[PDB]
Design a binder for this molecule. Structure first.
Ligand code: 7GZ
Length: 284
């Protein structure tokens, strides 16, 4: 339990429509310093967003894995109605920024180390029947040069006991969404795997602006609405191209994640083995 008065503001870390993230020092003895944490609050405190936020917290609360970011607590000092979530602070930020600034020290082998760690996380989420729903390079955090961790779990949904998909706004990362998520609003491990396919695309393009999924899909779309154009482009087997210099065996994994049919997509266990193996062939 974190008390507002001891929660000292250092700087803004990242923002969005109704949530924001701040770097903070939690200083219960005020003497003169304590421990640095990442703090999420809601801007527009609508009750659906609050209820969604409270459900995000329970998910975070239930997670313990070396490749998943650590929950520390919550602050109720000033209300329900302005809850704060408190998580560990990882200094190197998101994989999107990190990769983009440090790229010339990061080769295909490093990129495959990151990929492995991502699959181990999603494996572990699969065990708890969680569908992350926002797998993208911008929601993977870097603890150090040899370790990254998932999370922005604000879209994460728990699977029903009886079903293997979840039916569910507001801004969606459509260019990372699988076809059945666009057309029918279904989410599954299968759709999480599709997203991972495009994460693999992001890393192997080195997050170059002009090569990005929005950048690329919008070129192919040419030339309403935009989703409707995407859904149709995907149905005619339109896909993100092979990144320059991307291996055969990696590109194949991408292509397999982006299979129209849910049931023919690879599983995260399989993706771990395949990627862990490609590393060794590349190294030794
Ligand atoms: C508290 C919000 C949240 C809520 C979830 O459900 C899951 C993860 C997070 C989260 C998001 C971002 C961070 C960061 C960080 N460190 C940076 C350095 C530089 C630039 C950006 C950074 N973001 N550390 N820990 C973080 C936890």
């Amino acid at each position: 339990q974190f008390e507002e008065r001891h929660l000292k503001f250092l700087q803004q870390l990242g923002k969005g429509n109704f949530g924001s993230v701040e770097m903070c020092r939690y200083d219960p003895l005020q003497d003169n310093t304590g421990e640095v944490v990442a703090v999420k609050k809601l801007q527009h405190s609508t009750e659906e967003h609050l209820r969604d936020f409270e459900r995000e917290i329970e998910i975070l609360k239930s997670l313990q894995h070396d490749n998943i970011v650590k929950y520390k607590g919550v602050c109720y000092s000033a209300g329900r109605r302005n809850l704060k979530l408190i998580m560990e602070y990882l200094p190197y930020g998101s994989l999107r920024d990190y990769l983009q600034k440090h790229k010339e020290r990061i080769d295909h082998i490093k990129l495959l180390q990151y990929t492995s760690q991502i699959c181990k996380g999603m494996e572990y989420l699969g065990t708890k029947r969680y569908i992350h729903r926002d797998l993208a390079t911008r929601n993977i955090l870097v603890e150090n040069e040899n370790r990254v961790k998932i999370g922005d779990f604000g879209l994460t949904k728990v699977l029903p006991q009886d079903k293997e998909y979840y039916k569910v706004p507001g801004e969606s990362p459509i260019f990372w969404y699988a076809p059945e998520s666009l057309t029918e609003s279904k989410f599954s491990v299968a759709s999480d795997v599709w997203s991972f396919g495009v994460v693999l695309y992001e890393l192997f393009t080195y997050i170059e602006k002009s090569k990005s999924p929005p950048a690329e899909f919008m070129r192919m779309i040419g030339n309403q609405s935009i989703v409707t154009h995407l859904i149709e482009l995907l149905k005619n087997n339109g896909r993100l191209p092979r990144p320059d210099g991307c291996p055969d065996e990696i590109y194949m994994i991408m292509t397999e994640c982006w299979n129209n049919n849910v049931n023919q997509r690879p599983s995260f266990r399989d993706l771990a083995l395949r990627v862990d193996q490609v590393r060794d062939n590349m190294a030794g």
